[PDB]
Antibody, heavy 218, light 216 residues
Framework: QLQETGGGLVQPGGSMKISCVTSGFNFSHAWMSWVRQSPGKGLEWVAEIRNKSDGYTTYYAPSVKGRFTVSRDDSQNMVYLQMNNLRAEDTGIYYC????????????WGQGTTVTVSSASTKGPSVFPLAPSSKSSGGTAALGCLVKDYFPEPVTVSWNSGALTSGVHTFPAVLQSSGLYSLSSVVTVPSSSLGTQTYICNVNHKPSNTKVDKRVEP | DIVLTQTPLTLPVSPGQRATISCRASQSVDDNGHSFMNWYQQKPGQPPKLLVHAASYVKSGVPARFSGSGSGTDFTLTIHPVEPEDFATYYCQQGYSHPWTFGGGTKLEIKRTVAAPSVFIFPPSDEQLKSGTASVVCLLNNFYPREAKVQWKVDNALQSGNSQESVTEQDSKDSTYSLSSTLTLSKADYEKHKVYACEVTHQGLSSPVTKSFNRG
């Protein structure tokens, strides 16, 4: 019923235009909104465009007014968001939605398109071992891979090419003050396996088209 | 702008029990007998979905164990009983006046018994040290509830502002969390000290647990 496009990477000061195609309801009558989600700022309403009968009246969140422009094309069932003078704070998943005239609820949201605003160049991760500790209590050892200094999100980590899944924990990335992301992936294994079994983390980073395999040993 | 105070940020519920989610608006969102407060549900990697509009009107197809209530400035979403598919994040949103605003969210988490973390510490690799940075990682594995204090100490000096925590979602088998706390220092700073210690306080532990190593 709704589907967003156009998101990607851009530097602070830059511009980007995103779009949303719709179906399954009368578009020309509908009010349409944009809402964005930045991981750890929840949902934030961004803009609205109505018509139903008259005006193509537009409304904006204070912090994007002037910078952002919402438009529509009734003949193609398209809503647009033109974004200029972008800042790092604008980074997020942007969703288009149908705004109800009754409750001003947003009724039917698309899957979203992500806009990432940063000075960082795309870069694949450096992958370091988190080596099992020597000695020890119950015969379980934890080991892992530190996946450091990549941009943008995301990376995927597997273990022994997907053959090791039990007890794997891959943490969410944190954005470091450098503008690069970092995470770790860990797994717990039997202490008695450490001589006989090899353990390799496979780190895939689609935006750089890089794949890095790292063996982690004592 | 109408600020919405949604409480709590994280709400444990046992399967079968009631979930009560509150949303206070900083002024009234009533007009002509309608209270303009809407509720949404979001699961990871998915858009939000409208559940309730005008405070209490459940959207068609939403199950009956969801109910919205309240008026003026105080509103409630109740889920009774909480079925396993209901564990998700919930948001309130006022449609009274522009800008439209959302509450900060409420994640329903599965209540289970207390489980103490297993704690592990990892020196930086010699490989990372070559590059000029040192990352020291403390792992707390498979614990519940989420709340845990992780202190770093470096030759007994308490560390401040050079560490970041990251926590997994509840495990799908056992409903526990795991957490990493990563201390980032320059190679220079790393080399000035000997003892690196991670102290973990969690209600599952009678006394705090320290894991440490000496650089070497």
């Amino acid at each position: 019923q709704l589907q967003e496009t156009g998101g990607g990477l851009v530097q602070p000061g830059g511009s980007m235009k995103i779009s949303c195609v719709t179906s399954g309801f009368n578009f020309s009558h509908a009010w349409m909104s944009w809402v964005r989600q930045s991981p750890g700022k929840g949902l934030e309403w961004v803009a609205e465009i109505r018509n139903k009968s008259d005006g193509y009246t537009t409304y904006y969140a204070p912090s994007v007014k002037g910078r952002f422009t919402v438009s529509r094309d009734d003949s193609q069932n398209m809503v647009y968001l033109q974004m200029n003078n972008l800042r790092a704070e604008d980074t997020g998943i942007y969703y288009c939605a149908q705004s109800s005239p009754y409750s001003r609820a947003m009724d039917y949201w698309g899957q979203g398109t992500t806009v990432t605003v940063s000075s960082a160049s795309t870069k694949g991760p450096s992958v370091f071992p988190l080596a099992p500790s020597s000695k020890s209590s119950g015969g379980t050892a934890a080991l892992g891979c530190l996946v450091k200094d990549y941009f943008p999100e995301p990376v995927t980590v597997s273990w022994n090419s997907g053959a090791l899944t039990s007890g794997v924990h891959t943490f969410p990335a944190v954005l470091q003050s450098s503008g690069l992301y970092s995470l770790s992936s860990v797994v717990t294994v039997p202490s008695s396996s450490l001589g006989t079994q090899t353990y390799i983390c496979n780190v895939n980073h689609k935006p750089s088209n890089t794949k890095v395999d790292k063996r982690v040993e004592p | 702008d109408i600020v919405l105070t949604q409480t709590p940020l994280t709400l444990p519920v046992s399967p079968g029990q009631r979930a009560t989610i509150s949303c206070r608006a900083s002024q009234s969102v009533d007009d002509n007998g309608h209270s303009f407060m809407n509720w949404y549900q979001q699961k990871p990697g998915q858009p939000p979905k409208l559940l309730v509009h005008a405070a209490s009107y459940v959207k068609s197809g939403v199950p009956a164990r969801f109910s919205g209530s309240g008026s003026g400035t105080d509103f409630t979403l109740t889920i009774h009983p909480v079925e396993p598919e209901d564990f998700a994040t919930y948001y309130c949103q006022q449609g009274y006046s522009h800008p439209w605003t959302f509450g900060g969210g409420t994640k329903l988490e599965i209540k289970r018994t207390v489980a103490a973390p297993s704690v592990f510490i990892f020196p930086p690799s010699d490989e990372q040290l070559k590059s000029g940075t040192a990352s020291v990682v403390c792992l707390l594995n498979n614990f519940y509830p989420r709340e845990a204090k992780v202190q770093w100490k470096v030759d007994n000096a308490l560390q401040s502002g050079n560490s970041q925590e990251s926590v997994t979602e509840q495990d799908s088998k056992d409903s526990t969390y795991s957490l990493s706390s990563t201390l980032t220092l320059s190679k220079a700073d790393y080399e000035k000290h000997k003892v690196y210690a991670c102290e973990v306080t969690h209600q599952g532990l009678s006394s705090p647990v320290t894991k440490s190593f000496n650089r070497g």
